[model samples]
Target: NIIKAFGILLCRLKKYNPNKFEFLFLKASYADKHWTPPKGLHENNESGLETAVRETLEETGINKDKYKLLNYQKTLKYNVKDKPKETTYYLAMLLNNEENVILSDEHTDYKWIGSHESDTYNLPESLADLLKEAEEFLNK
Candidate 1:
């Protein structure tokens, strides 16, 4: 069997609400549904930041103007089709958490979880850990 190769194809984005102190998670459209921050593969040769911004808007209908991107960044070793891959995540704070997000077809629903709450929905360890990391950075 030939080894399948893949590079950094998807990117990182996290939207947080300062008031509720919650993080926005979108439930994916797939049958194996899971909640995750907005993200997408590279398009138009844009940088990871740009890609995240675009993906966030396309997925969550939250424009770049509504949130502020933070300086903290995390590049996680990820996977796709059981092949090794990577995704880097950037943090953003929603100016007004009360604002609603209209989901695109990529996702069916969304949830905002507080930092103190225990994991109720099944979340990947990698992503949950990243949430802690980003929260710490935000508290900085």
Candidate 2:
């Protein structure tokens, strides 16, 4: 049985001087202040990817027009709030050069982070590894 649905997405780093990459993360509005990608349970008749893109846009105001979704969707199974949960992730790249992040009450703050700072961002091991793997994939 499905207990919960979630989005565990990564946003590509944009055109900075370093030309490096990072991922977008949100500080939780409650609980342990753990950082995670934008996500939530599926509502109504939404598909998993629909929930992912919707949650991301709602939380960050990053619309589909400003980003391109990757072909592959990554998934991981874990426990959240003591309940077995399944999270689906997708890779995305920002299409606009000058983009602003508009945050929502669901998250306290937002961050665009490189791998080093990302290492200490209070993420679950699975999520951390996902970011790491994404980095290696982009690097090649």
Candidate 3:
């Protein structure tokens, strides 16, 4: 019951861009250069969702004003730091405009890719599953 995972207010661009819903993933320039979405390890007493939102802003510059968390449907579970990690994802659509993506040294590259090609990327399996699940959810 004390499981944990840290991540962003993750969103699939597909909800707005139907035919070409490209999800964004980052390739870290640090560590093992592992691929992942915008996220960070949990800190302090912040709730998982809080961590997600905070990490997204810090990592992707996605402001809350521009992206609304889809509170009705939001969740993802995966491993991190060698423990059982789970994350609650919030679906977001641009309320204002897309901001310019700027990555920290931890990330060297970013991509907005469609669901079909997501598997080929270097991201973790859980992140990929999050993409698939979000895509199917939007289709309904």
Candidate 4:
């Protein structure tokens, strides 16, 4: 699953300018070593949104209090380790740009990225496209 959000501009890096929005990406220590949003499998009696919120907090230390969940929904169906899975994504607005994102051992690194830099992150093909879709859906 992919978890992303929106944000205002922050003055940190000149070239790493995110004019429209900001989100976070955790670089997994897996063999792929690829970066992605905080996500995990769903548990019983839990909705996708609950799973998304819980996973985000567990992985990045950003809880529901910091974001106002939106109704925008996107689902990416694919296979995980040869098993069929549909990763449900939700929309949220990061209330502040300066919130600290503490990471767990599952991820080696994290980035406060922008929607404009979505495709630049070399995310999985589906997530890369999904981010683009989200950008245009929210603000073209």
Predicted model with the maximum lDDT: 2
Off by over 4 Å in 4: 1-19, 115-119
Question: How well does candidate 2 match the true structure in TM-score terms?
Answer: 0.86
Q: Is candidate 1 or candidate 2 better by TM-score?
A: 2
What is the lDDT for 118 in model 4? 62
Q: Give TM-scores for every candidate, taking all chains together and pairing residue i with residue i.
A: 0.80, 0.86, 0.74, 0.78
Worst 10 residues of 3 by lDDT: 11-20
Best by TM-score: 2
The best-first sequence of candidates by TM-score reads 2, 1, 4, 3
- Which candidate do you rate higher for TM-score, 1 or 4? 1
Encode model 2's per-residue lDDT on 32-126: one tens digit a residue.
75888888878888988788888888888877778877765678898766778777887777666457888898778888877666557877778
Q: Write the per-residue lDDT of candidate 3 for residues 30-72, one digit (tens) a residue.
A: 6674666677757798887677777877777776676666633
- lDDT of every predicted structure (CA atoms): 0.68, 0.75, 0.64, 0.67
Q: Candidate 2's C-alpha lDDT?
A: 0.75
Residue 92 in model 1: lDDT = 78
Model 4's alpha-carbon lDDT is 0.67
